[PDB]
Amino acid sequence: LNREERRETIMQAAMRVALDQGFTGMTVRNIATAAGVAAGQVHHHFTSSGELKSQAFIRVIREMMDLQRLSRTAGWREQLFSALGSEDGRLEPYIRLWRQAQLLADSDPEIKSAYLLTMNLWHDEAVRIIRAGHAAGEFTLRDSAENIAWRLISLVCGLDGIYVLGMPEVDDAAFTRHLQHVIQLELFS
Amino acid sequence: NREERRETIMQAAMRVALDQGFTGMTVRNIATAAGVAAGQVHHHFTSSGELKSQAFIRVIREMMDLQRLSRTAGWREQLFSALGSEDGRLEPYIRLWRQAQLLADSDPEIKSAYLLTMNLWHDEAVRIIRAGHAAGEFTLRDSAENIAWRLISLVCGLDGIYVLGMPEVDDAAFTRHLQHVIQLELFS
Ligand SMILES: CN(C)c1ccc(C(=C2C=CC(=[N+](C)C)C=C2)c2ccccc2)cc1
Ligand SMILES: CN(C)c1ccc(C(=C2C=CC(=[N+](C)C)C=C2)c2ccccc2)cc1
């Protein structure tokens, strides 16, 4: 195992620890355990535990973007709705982490940078889908795919920030309804 | 006396909230900003958290009172002003509100208050939407409540991205997006 592959195995272990315990639980001891190596090796391959935490978080969100993706043959409406509000049960720990990364972004510079980067990734996926569906003729763009993507992502972020508070008139069903509706308005004139 | 000193103490809490945020809302500083002894605030407010939360609610209520327009301007302008004004003087209010949304994750009292301010915001948006629909200016393809939730959600999200320093999401871009979604929601 060359150095890149040790760095990599440790990174993946850190991804599991992130999805199982969150940011608080990503101690070098738990990461070293999950990777099956001695802590000293984790310190030798990742000199900043903070940097390791952030990069692992980024990789987790990337994996979330790959897990939510549908087959190319699927309708473009369905694809976009998956990339924004997928109800797939496998995504729970990822979302739970992303949410956390938001909060800790207020008090941790590195986590804030990583969170911004993940927002850019989310946007990239949404734009990709909007462009493909536009070229296919299913979506109707009266604005650029970038702006539309930022507005949809904003809708999801706000509706989630309200969903977590426990308001009854905004529940899972309401969430999906709203997201589908804004998609209809933005791309099906 | 009874409610007037309570009101002066509340005004103190509000000023300290707009000036420093929740962290600086200590009874020792609030009492000084009110010109009273530190114990009287304990006479008037059982829990310090109760004071922080109630004063926050009052701050947001005042924000909404400042953002309400002359009732004769176009309904679109009233709604927008109720949603997304770019006035710098509001940033101390906005700041506080942001702070609240964060502390709601770790403080049930501030959580209750924050929920309450969100419902107030909602009630205002619904008011303007219904009034504009009656006036024939707004065209509703959905209930004013759902439209309100989607618009407020747009504002909250775009704010969350705006605070990160995203260059493509700045003041101007924010305005553009909000205007656009209003156009889609009420002018089909
Ligand atoms: C960090 N951040 C602001 C957020 C991050 C993610 C989410 C998500 C989500 C979508 C619908 C939900 N529903 C159905 C309640 C719950 C979460 C989500 C976003 C994209 C793809 C799949 C799920 C929301 C907010
Ligand atoms: C805590 N929370 C979810 C939020 C609290 C306040 C805001 C606001 C706002 C609107 C536009 C902005 N721009 C132009 C950057 C900045 C703040 C805002 C809300 C209502 C009236 C005026 C401004 C947004 C989110």
Author numbering:
A (entry chain B): 4 to 192
B (entry chain A): 5 to 192
Question: What text appears in the publication on this structure?
Answer:
In its native context, EilR regulates expression of EilA, an inner membrane transporter that confers tolerance to imidazolium-based ionic liquids, reagents that enhance the microbial conversion of lignocellulosic biomass to chemicals. EilR belongs to the TetR family of transcription factors, which commonly regulate divergently transcribed adjacent genes. Amino acid residues 1–192 of each monomer form 9 α-helices arranged in two domains: the N-terminal DNA-binding domain consists of residues 1–52, forming three α-helices, and the C-terminal ligand-binding domain comprises residues 53–192, forming six α-helices.
In a similar manner to the EilR-operator complex, we used crystallography to investigate the EilR structure in complex with each of two cationic triarylmethane ligands, malachite green (MG) and the most potent inducer CV. To demonstrate the specificity of these negatively charged residues for ligand binding, we created Ala substitutions of EilR and examined their ability to de-repress RFP expression via PJExD in the presence of MG and CV. While the Glu90 and Asp175 mutants induced RFP to a similar extent as wild-type EilR, the absence of Asp163 caused a dramatic decrease in expression, suggesting that Asp163 is required for EilR to recognize the positive charge of these inducers. While several of the EilR-inducing dyes, notably methylene blue and malachite green, inhibited growth of E. coli at high concentrations, CV, acridine orange, and pyronin had only minimal effects on growth rate at concentrations required for full induction. Comparison of EilR in its induced and DNA-bound forms showed a significant conformational change around the ligand-binding sites.
